[PDB]
Design a protein around this ligand. Structure first.
Ligand SMILES: N#Cc1cccc(CN2CCc3ncn(Cc4ccc(Cl)cc4)c(=O)c3C2)c1
Ligand SMILES: N#Cc1cccc(CN2CCc3ncn(Cc4ccc(Cl)cc4)c(=O)c3C2)c1
Ligand SMILES: N#Cc1cccc(CN2CCc3ncn(Cc4ccc(Cl)cc4)c(=O)c3C2)c1
Ligand SMILES: N#Cc1cccc(CN2CCc3ncn(Cc4ccc(Cl)cc4)c(=O)c3C2)c1
Ligand SMILES: N#Cc1cccc(CN2CCc3ncn(Cc4ccc(Cl)cc4)c(=O)c3C2)c1
Ligand SMILES: N#Cc1cccc(CN2CCc3ncn(Cc4ccc(Cl)cc4)c(=O)c3C2)c1
Ligand SMILES: N#Cc1cccc(CN2CCc3ncn(Cc4ccc(Cl)cc4)c(=O)c3C2)c1
Ligand SMILES: N#Cc1cccc(CN2CCc3ncn(Cc4ccc(Cl)cc4)c(=O)c3C2)c1
Ligand SMILES: N#Cc1cccc(CN2CCc3ncn(Cc4ccc(Cl)cc4)c(=O)c3C2)c1
Lengths: 178, 181, 178, 178, 179, 179, 176, 179, 179
């Protein structure tokens, strides 16, 4: 299914990694996180300082899996450029807003949602709400919107255009080309 | 069961071989995974030459809409000119990726069937958020075909396929070819 | 299993009290049975009040709008009652009972937000048409404006009966018979 | 669990509907539904060939041949036939609607009404043969030209009552009788 | 769910049988045959000479199953009126054509097919042909058409209008209201 | 839906039993055998002289279960008339073949096979499949009067007999169009 | 599977309703709540002052369903004797402890749990859990904080414990 | 398991591609169309004069997908030789019928049908099924030289042609036993 | 899991092909045919005149699929030795009998069936007979038996010993060790 590019040969995904590109496409579960995180770990390995690019077209995922990616971004020292294409919904839009500031881009026609929809083992009512609070905090930190504003907004079941998402605090740039 | 071809000497699979020739295939229904794979091919073919044209082959009935836009956006983005080709069919997102190639490089072979009507995706979605997305498609189709909104709107209301000649005359493609020009 | 009272089954017996039961989700068949029950009671009496027990989590919008239209149609007074919850189409029925006769028991949940009608596949321009009808019905029956209804229906949340009372969905909140 | 009403004599509420001359057409039209309606239509005629029959329609359509039998049986019998659309009348379901007796086709306010067809294995010529029957059937009862019909039925959309009235599917859009 | 209608009170399919109406709706199988034949052997007993009506709407079914329903229709003394609503394809149409001459009917918007599609066991290739040739001879007989004409026309994968059905030999009248 | 006929209330399958008609529509498993044997004994209790009628239209069934019915037939005293409509295949045609002599009928278009098809109540050894097969030979040869080597080579051929071919072989006695 | 008893011919469940015994066997989904509420309003119509006996052997259920059985209980004029056999887990022990004071019972070897077992939002899901905290408080006469910490243990208490904690009043083995 | 042949290592399906043999075993869906079109272009890149060989043995497939291949065939410059073994049914026989003239072969025992069977990439309206059917007429009439009314009544009949009957109709040119 | 054996090193099915052994194990379908034919068209190319060996153990398969494998065996110039181990029923036996005269073999404990059981589409009744008659003519040809003898004997649902197979015309030798 997946083609080979050539100089001296890799496959095209291995090839995107040689360009320091971690894809996060589709739903976020523990494996995807385990996979993204090894790549982030590998790239900082290669340079403490060279930026990393994180292409994000996801529709959500397991919160605890999403959070180990947030945490790892925060852990590594590289500048981290995050790219949303197609959509970044729920956990993905958190990952998207967690990029290095002034490096969170969205392509022109994407859709962005922070509304949580609806986790591994089932959990108690208080343990979900403790989790939701962690998301509030992460979103307030990265958008500079107040706690109250993050909450009142995650209550609406809607999407933002990249420009709304830019002016809320999730994106900095919105493109068309370089 | 994918064949191998040889060409010192080197051996590719035949799909990897089509990518040397700068051809990205969009055959089949479009989802996030396809779009991931198409984008990768598109950004590589640019990094090997951002002026050398990329050819995209579109034989598709549709797909996730957001995943469809993700391609159209990577389309508009890259410096390369893009030659679109429609064999078989191009419906919904297929006709959008078809009509979203470089002006005057948009092709159908003769017996193809084109539809811009959308079928009645991804996770479940509020009413307004749908009409949001619909209106985007209304603007993209307008942009490239050079038709008006009310025209594109009334056109996508009809549940029908059009002929490469008819699609041309509408603004979806530019040439309809039988043999190598 | 359903039981027998004295010579009647218990649900058929509830019908003798002019109690029509909208339990569970609302599909074309539940609509057919309800409307059949509402027409019947009216032929019994034009003016004798009819009681509609609503504990529904929502349903098919076109199935619902029909039960709504019948309620409008029959000359009877209708007392709606909400127990357990009245979500999506169900709250729309609750709100549509006769003014001053929309009740709710104390621990219910009421949600007018719509979920993520379902009969055949349908176009964006049609799904919006529907929502706009819900906006009218709801705004018509809550003395709120389209502006107020469209916003509230955007929040993905439930209302307490006293909150649902102060908005316009229901009139009373009983604990015992008044 | 279909309820029981007593008049004196024990009747299930759908039995009771049919002792009011009300044939229901809930839900999708298939062969068994067709057989079942055709039986009630013939019954009620034997009963009386002058007393009108009320045909209740909340159908997203169904099998084309089966719809045609219910159509022809209507046309066959002598009774005035009132049609009532409540909820939705789509595809074949709205042929049965507009196939009612002139002056006697009704719909309630919040219905939807679609004549676009959806999409016993059939060839290509036979699909067009059937559609060409529908065209004709719709063209007769609306009084629209075959041309005005064919255009309409390729638009993928629903009508309000008042459209479907401006067009020849209904005659009346009621909200309450006298 | 089957309604009741009303002395005495019957479910609407039972009351139809009271009017001497046997129904053949949908795919014909061994059960639909044993139940038809029960209904046919019963109406003969209540009157050897009173007409029965078979309401056919059916896309065919098992070949042997429909022959049983045929063989009984030919055994019993009753005149048999056949009515076609909806469709009558495959074996269904054989039963349509197998009514008493001049009492085979269709309603106006019906579709009729004698083509067979592509049977209770699995059987060799010789036996399928036997079955087919059994149908040629039956269709030949009631249409009064030749073997070759029946044979050429069951080749064509199409449906007849109630009119060309009438012209062919499959039915005798197409009605729009009572006469 | 099974309709109701009136005189008392009577579902049509019971109404047939009041006529002394035992049905063998469908395949043969232990339950059909049980439900048939019970009607055979019931009617004989009723009267050990009045004929019983077995309507057979069967693709076959469990060999032992269909043996159980043959053994009940031979045990009851009644004249038994067997009628084949549709088809009587394997165990079905054995039952057909075991009416009492001169009373075994088919209809014209019916089909009849005594080939055993390649089921079982519990998997069994090879000798035990022959022990059964040989019983079905010996049973068949008795009621056809044909020899074993004429029954054996017969059941080898994986084909269907016309009823007239079944009349000549000894499987039946009358092949009738009308009563 | 459901036998008949003669009187004058009821199935034995219809017979238990004639004795004013409403059964809440099973998990609690909306149809059970629809059914229970139907019986409670009926027994009230017959004599709004005769007691009703609610039998309870349930592992839990759809929270809002149980809250409709709850709400109905509190609504009707009639005393309600709640009787736990087998177990009253989650919403079950809610209904159990929501009987008329003094009339909340358990046969000896019952198991009682007020821990909730582990689709909507998180703020909603808490809004519900806080409803349960109050209701359990209201009837056990334990304090909010104590109910919260209580319900936090995944445990099952004995009919004696359940009594001490305020969930039931009488642990009995034979009649009086 | 697909074996490996030696000269370099070569799986046998690639070894056929080195001979310029594109296979169309199996039914036709978008992926077969994609995987065939890629081999057609590959070989033409190789040489726009050398003949290509299409081995067809297909029960049919998605009409649009099989159109995509016909359009690729007509676009490439190469002499295309089509060989039918086993069968070429519906869309398969269209491809068969569209080799370049005088180079369309069958083997002796092969079977050939241009009946369209009663699939699809997304459910479609009725007019759109005719828009396709009429394309398949016009395509067929071109490569057989037969008229439309001779193609139309042809494809009605739900049968198979012998290869010699296919040679005479215009679907092929050679019917050969050995090379 | 397939073993490797050993210069160069092959998987054991690849190494068998090196010995010019094509295998036909199990049910024959369009793929097994396109893969056999690849293996057959390849061994002809490496030598038009060197013998190929087809190892047949198979209970038959699709009828058209096996004809394709036949049609190629008749096309290629190669002498073809056929070996039967296990069983060779239905189309398998046709391929067994379709080897070069005097090079058709079986091992001693094999079972052989020419009876066909009870095919890539669904097809009418006329086409199944066409297929069957195509098999009569093929079996007639290689056994040198008459049409009627082939016809009578495919009626019998049985299996031949490798000896009576040899006597009939299906094979030429039964071996116990190398000669
Ligand atoms: N879950 C997890 C996880 C996530 C973030 C950070 C860490 C910390 N750990 C501690 C151990 C460690 N040891 C070596 N390296 C260098 C390296 C990494 C990957 C590659 Cl491929 C090559 C070299 C580390 O980065 C870390 C980070 C854990
Ligand atoms: N979804 C997505 C997406 C779509 C369009 C543009 C971008 C932006 N990205 C950011 C980082 C980046 N880094 C390297 N290149 C060159 C290159 C890429 C892949 C290969 Cl194999 C070889 C070279 C880029 O083009 C970009 C553009 C994101
Ligand atoms: N979908 C539908 C639908 C919904 C509401 C109203 C109507 C209009 N219809 C038309 C015919 C009719 N005929 C008799 N009655 C009296 C009656 C009905 C049922 C019973 Cl059991 C007893 C008495 C009517 O109320 C109506 C109203 C249609
Ligand atoms: N498919 C079908 C079908 C559709 C329309 C008309 C007919 C004609 N049939 C034939 C025989 C017949 N016999 C009696 N009646 C009166 C009656 C009917 C049902 C009941 Cl319960 C009671 C009385 C008839 O109307 C007809 C008309 C067939
Ligand atoms: N398969 C079958 C089958 C079809 C047609 C005729 C027969 C022959 N049989 C034999 C025995 C018999 N016994 C009584 N009757 C009268 C009767 C039947 C049923 C009822 Cl409810 C009422 C009266 C018969 O007509 C026959 C005809 C078999
Ligand atoms: N398998 C079985 C089986 C087959 C043949 C014979 C028997 C013997 N048995 C013994 C017990 C018995 N007792 C009463 N009767 C008369 C009767 C039967 C059924 C009904 Cl409904 C009414 C009356 C008997 O005929 C027998 C026959 C068993
Ligand atoms: N969810 C629900 C629900 C819960 C509590 C109260 C109510 C209010 N309603 C109003 C209508 C009504 N009408 C008659 N009765 C007496 C009665 C009830 C059932 C039977 Cl079988 C027999 C008599 C009532 O108790 C009520 C209570 C709704
Ligand atoms: N569906 C499809 C399709 C069908 C017919 C024509 C085309 C046009 N395209 C345009 C791009 C292109 N670019 C290079 N080549 C040479 C080549 C092709 C494949 C390989 Cl492996 C090696 C070399 C082309 O032939 C084409 C044809 C598309
Ligand atoms: N179904 C099929 C089929 C079966 C037998 C013969 C043919 C006809 N074809 C046409 C083209 C062709 N081209 C090359 N060769 C030589 C060769 C083939 C494969 C390999 Cl691996 C090596 C050499 C041919 O034999 C043929 C015969 C079709």
């Amino acid at each position: 299914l997946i083609p080979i590019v050539v100089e001296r040969a890799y496959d095209i995904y291995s090839r995107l990694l040689r360009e320091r590109i971690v894809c996060v496409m589709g739903p976020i579960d523990d494996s995807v996180a385990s996979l993204v995180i090894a790549q982030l770990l590998f790239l900082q390995s290669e340079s403490n300082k060279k930026p990393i690019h994180m292409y994000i077209n996801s529709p959500g995922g397991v919160v605890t899996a999403g959070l180990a990616i947030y945490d790892t971004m925060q852990y590594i020292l590289n500048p981290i450029c995050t790219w949303c294409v197609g959509q970044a919904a729920s956990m993905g839009s958190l990952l998207l807003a967690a990029g290095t500031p002034g490096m969170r881009h969205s392509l022109p026609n994407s859709r962005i949602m922070i509304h949580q929809p609806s986790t591994d083992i089932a959990i108690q009512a208080e343990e979900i709400m403790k989790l939701k609070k962690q998301l509030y905090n992460i979103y307030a930190k990265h958008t500079k919107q107040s706690l109250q504003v993050i909450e009142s907004a995650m209550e609406r079941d809607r999407y933002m255009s990249p420009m709304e998402a830019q002016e809320f605090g999730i994106l900095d740039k919105v493109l068309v080309h370089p």
